[PDB]
């Protein structure tokens, strides 16, 4: 999954001074994925949405929105209700993972050496 | 032939005495006694046309 917005407030220096430039991140994705523009009536059910990055399956857009009627269930993940019947299947899977396995990968400003590109 | 018409009677008239266990049992035999009589009546109707199979068929 790739959780990213449409507009990202990226700083930049104008006349030597810092000023905010609302970056249109949407144009970042479509350059990365030229598959989304070339839309044919079967592609939203295609197996690999982008044969370059077969890893990528959904792109969770997180942009605050002010319209009353939110996005239709075609493009929103259900995040309310009892998702099961007999047992919240998290506490089952919450038994198997260990308090010493990753949950984060924070990028590294200055890396110890060429290997440590991120810290887990 | 009236498994639907029978149940609807049971629902709206029985339901306090006759346990529907009987009904779905009553429906399971009546769909067999009717079946076998079709297999017997045919077995007698070939035995004239000359097929002639023994008790063990």
């Amino acid at each position: 999954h790739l959780v990213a917005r449409e507009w990202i407030n990226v700083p930049e220096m104008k006349q030597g001074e810092l000023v905010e430039r609302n970056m249109h991140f949407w144009d970042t994705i479509y350059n990365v994925i030229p598959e989304l523009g070339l839309s044919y009536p079967g592609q939203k059910f295609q197996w690999v949405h982008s044969q370059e990055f077969y890893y990528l399956k959904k792109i969770i857009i997180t942009d605050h929105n002010m319209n009353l009627l939110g996005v239709t269930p075609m493009r929103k993940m259900l995040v309310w209700g009892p998702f099961s019947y007999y047992e919240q299947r998290l506490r089952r899977l919450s038994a198997l993972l260990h308090p010493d396995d990753p949950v984060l990968a924070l990028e590294d400003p200055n890396p110890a050496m060429e290997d440590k590109l991120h810290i887990t | 032939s009236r498994r639907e018409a029978l149940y609807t009677w049971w629902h709206n008239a029985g339901m306090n005495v006759i346990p529907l266990g009987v009904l779905q049992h009553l429906e399971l035999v009546s769909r067999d006694i009717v079946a076998q009589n079709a297999r017997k009546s045919y077995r007698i109707e070939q035995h004239e046309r000359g097929i002639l199979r023994t008790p063990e068929m």
């Binding site: - | 498994r3 609807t8 629902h11 529907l20 779905q24 429906e27």
Partner: protein
């Protein structure tokens, strides 16, 4: 496999009271009451060893049931295995 879709006979009525034939599994199986009864590693009762003298009640009945002269001590009083600080050792 394709599952169970193309739904059930596609009939409807008030009658609708004659069928179960759960897929076998949804009949004490996928009601997973106890199938691990056969597929779970046992936790063995106390084992009498040459050194470890752990008694067991499960065997002691097969003696307490017998028609034996020279009766046996009751089980609880036969146990080496149960007020300073709630009673000392």
């Amino acid at each position: 496999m394709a599952g169970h879709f193309n739904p059930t006979p596609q009939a409807n009525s008030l009658a609708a009271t004659h069928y179960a034939h759960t897929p076998e599994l949804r009949h004490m199986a996928d009601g997973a009451a106890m199938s691990l009864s056969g597929q779970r590693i046992p936790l063995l009762k106390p084992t009498l060893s040459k050194w470890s003298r752990q008694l067991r009640s499960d065997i002691y009945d097969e003696l307490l049931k017998l028609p034996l002269r020279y009766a046996l001590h009751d089980f609880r009083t036969l146990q080496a295995h149960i007020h300073a600080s709630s009673g000392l050792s």
